[PDB]
């Protein structure tokens, strides 16, 4: 075995502490401890003080030696070493022990979410719960923009109804004429104007970028997107009018 690790006096370092050092230190470093490693000091002293060597030390030299050796509490135990050796294995295997940020910190949720996607080198395929979970996937797929089997005008109508119904509120309330007796027809006009402006922007997008994911086969490129935008304008008008009708009637 290694020469300097045999018959080392307990006064230099205790048996349990030495075993803890040897466990913490990687095996390949036992023969020649590097430098600034407790094992390096153990070697540099056990080769000077021992049974066949200098058996006594000055009180100050021994005092300084006792403050260079580990104090039996600053060394990781077997379970902690297992924690590290397995945490690093998880991290390198592409799996992340799931954690959630909290009040300046994060709680470990005790879950192994496989992190690297199907393309391990792709940066945007790292799968997370909020985008790649079952609920997230089915929610995104079932949106009007993505729902299967919807004609482009249906997607446009649904999105427009949502936008037009919502956009009335910010104007009819806390608007310039929020306290007038009408106070809602103004909001209706402003919401219809916002719907028209964003529809014009969508028409610009469809006449410049021309997305072709909604076009049926053998059609003018971007025709599906243009139809979706026109029916979004129609749906925005309808939703704004419906919200105004509900506000006035009720």
């Amino acid at each position: 075995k290694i020469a300097y690790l045999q018959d080392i006096p307990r006064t230099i370092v205790e048996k349990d502490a030495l075993e803890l050092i040897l466990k913490n230190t990687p095996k390949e470093q036992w023969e020649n401890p590097p430098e600034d490693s407790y094992l390096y000091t153990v070697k540099a002293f056990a080769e000077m003080y021992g049974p066949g060597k200098a058996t006594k030390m000055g009180w100050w030299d021994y005092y300084r030696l006792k403050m260079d050796m580990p104090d039996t509490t600053r060394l990781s135990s077997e379970r902690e070493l297992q924690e590290i050796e397995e945490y690093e294995k998880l991290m390198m295997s592409g799996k992340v022990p799931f954690a959630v940020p909290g009040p300046s910190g994060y709680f470990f949720t005790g879950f192994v979410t496989q992190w690297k996607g199907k393309e391990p080198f792709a940066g945007d395929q790292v799968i997370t719960l909020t985008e790649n979970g079952l609920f997230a996937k089915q929610f995104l797929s079932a949106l009007a923009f993505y729902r299967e089997g919807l004609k482009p005008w249906q997607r446009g109508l649904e999105i427009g109804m949502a936008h037009g119904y919502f956009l009335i509120g910010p104007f009819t309330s806390l608007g310039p004429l929020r306290n007038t007796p009408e106070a809602a027809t103004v909001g209706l006009l402003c919401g219809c104007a916002i719907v028209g402006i964003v529809s014009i922007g969508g028409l610009i997008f469809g006449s410049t970028i021309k997305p072709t994911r909604f076009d049926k086969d053998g059609d003018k490129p971007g025709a599906g997107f243009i139809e979706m935008i026109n029916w979004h304008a129609v749906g925005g008008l309808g939703g704004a009018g419906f919200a105004h009708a509900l506000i006035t009637v009720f």
Binding site: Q82, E83, K89, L90, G110, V112, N132, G133, L134
Partner: protein
């Protein structure tokens, strides 16, 4: 046990004690047992929020309901429900109705784990061997044991309130 093995190591005082002192699970099929758990977790998850909602309302924090009723509602959560404006209650029912619709029809949970309403099963491992993770069974215990306590707790709140104030 056979079929109760699908919900094994997940209940009892200690985690691996199938309690069932009524035979409610024996002779029942695997899908029925999974559906019984889906009912248990859903009750418990609502019970946990119910108890938290009860305490943040029985202490004096009913802002939406003090600002809608234009007066501080009574601390007693049962009596505060009556004072809460009917528009508020109907919207509360509708929001849960949308959530219950959303989970069931558009984004259904799997049929093997009908309680994965968020759907971690497509990114979770649950079967690896790491220590600093793969404690998902333990956090399943904490959800179930806490939720079961919340279920009997919230009933105690309602029963005592409706009887001995």
């Amino acid at each position: 046990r056979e079929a109760p093995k699908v919900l094994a190591g997940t209940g009892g005082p200690l985690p691996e004690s199938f309690w069932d002192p009524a035979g409610f699970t024996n002779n029942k099929t695997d899908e029925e047992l999974l559906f019984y758990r889906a009912a248990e977790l859903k009750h418990g998850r609502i019970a946990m929020a119910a108890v938290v909602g009860w305490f943040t309302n029985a202490s004096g924090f009913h802002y939406l309901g003090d600002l809608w009723l234009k007066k501080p509602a009574s601390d007693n959560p049962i009596e505060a429900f009556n004072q809460l404006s009917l528009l508020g209650v109907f919207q509360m029912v509708f929001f849960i109705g949308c959530l219950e619709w959303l989970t069931t029809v558009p984004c259904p949970p799997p049929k093997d784990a009908p309680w994965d309403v968020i759907g971690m099963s497509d990114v979770l491992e649950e079967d690896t061997d790491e220590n600093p993770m793969a404690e998902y069974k333990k956090i399943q215990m904490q959800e179930l044991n806490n939720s079961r306590l919340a279920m009997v707790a919230i009933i105690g709140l309602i029963v005592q309130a409706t009887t001995t104030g």
